[PDB]
Design an enzyme around this catalytic site. Structure first.
Site: not given
Ligand SMILES: CCC(=O)Nc1nc(C)cs1
Length: 281
Positions: A180, A214-221, A261
């Site tokens: 998290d 992921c949620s926004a598609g920028i960080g983990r992705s 991010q």
């Protein structure tokens, strides 16, 4: 070499500084289609938009918009679609995109609920005998099999185009253990997951691009695509140590804003590539 660059930045604690120079140097392209008022409820986050030049278009005459970008890495011969976690009202659009782009794999790097809030709609079936029908896009989705492991789940889905009665098998790769807060302590399970996606054939040029979210598609992705592309370039080049992570990231940021991010995700990307290079040399 990145291993020495890593120790330098780590010993000097300069991660926030490197990260800010990347932010400064990153491309900025128009995202006019994303900001049309008729698309407001197709975006999860008002500050995360696809660029017009790289956005995926849905083949529906009404509204072609989805929050998704094509990332084309010419030298590595890899493409990726990076997208947000679908909303309750865009689950149909999500599967339409998968169908239209001939994707073989979906890579999900978040849980449906994190930090007590919904990060993503539940967009796949939880049981074999309870299939999902997307009336707006005329698609049916069935869970075929589910293999639950410690760090990830792989699901075999059948997607059926109700219009043409064609069916395709889609593989869903769900990384379930990203914490998290912050990043994993070790990149071992993330690398294991990345090799599993590769082994499936989902990243291969025979298929349409993999869908990563992921949620926004920028960080983990972002971390997923950056690691994959960097390791592939190290296989391809005469000199593996000519691979500059920062350059690759800036090239990827031409296609979608904000990839990676936090300074912690940047450090984790270096660690993943450095560790992955051992299993590749
Ligand atoms: C049992 C689910 C599963 O692992 N399906 C897979 N098929 C391929 C080709 C990779 S994973």
């Amino acid at each position: 070499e990145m291993e020495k660059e890593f120790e330098q930045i780590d010993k000097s604690g300069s991660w926030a500084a490197i990260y800010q120079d990347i932010r400064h140097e990153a491309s900025d392209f128009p995202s006019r289609v994303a900001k049309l008022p008729k698309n407001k409820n197709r975006n999860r986050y008002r500050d995360v938009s696809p660029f017009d030049h790289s956005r995926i278009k849905l083949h529906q005459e009404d509204n072609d918009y989805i929050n998704a970008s094509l990332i084309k890495m010419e030298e590595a011969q890899r493409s990726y679609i990076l997208t947000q976690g679908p909303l309750p009202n865009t689950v149909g659009h999500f599967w339409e995109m998968v169908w239209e782009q001939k994707s073989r794999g979906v890579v999900m790097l978040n849980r449906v609920m994190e930090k007590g809030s919904l990060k993503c709609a539940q967009y796949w079936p939880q049981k074999e005998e309870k299939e999902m029908i997307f009336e707006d896009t005329n698609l049916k989705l069935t869970l075929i099999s589910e293999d639950i492991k410690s760090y990830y789940t792989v699901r075999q889905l059948e997607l059926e185009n109700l219009t043409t009665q064609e069916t395709r098998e889609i593989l869903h790769f769900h990384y379930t253990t990203w914490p998290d807060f912050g990043v994993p302590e070790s990149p071992a399970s993330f690398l294991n997951f990345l090799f599993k996606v590769r082994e499936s054939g989902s990243l291969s040029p025979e298929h349409g691009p993999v869908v990563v979210h992921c949620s926004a598609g920028i960080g983990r992705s972002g971390t997923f695509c950056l690691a994959d592309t960097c390791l592939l370039l190290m296989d391809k080049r005469k000199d593996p140590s000519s691979v500059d992570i920062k350059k690759v990231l800036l090239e990827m940021r031409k296609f979608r804003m904000g990839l990676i991010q936090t300074a912690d995700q940047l450090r984790f990307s270096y660690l993943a590539v450095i560790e992955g290079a051992k299993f590749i040399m």
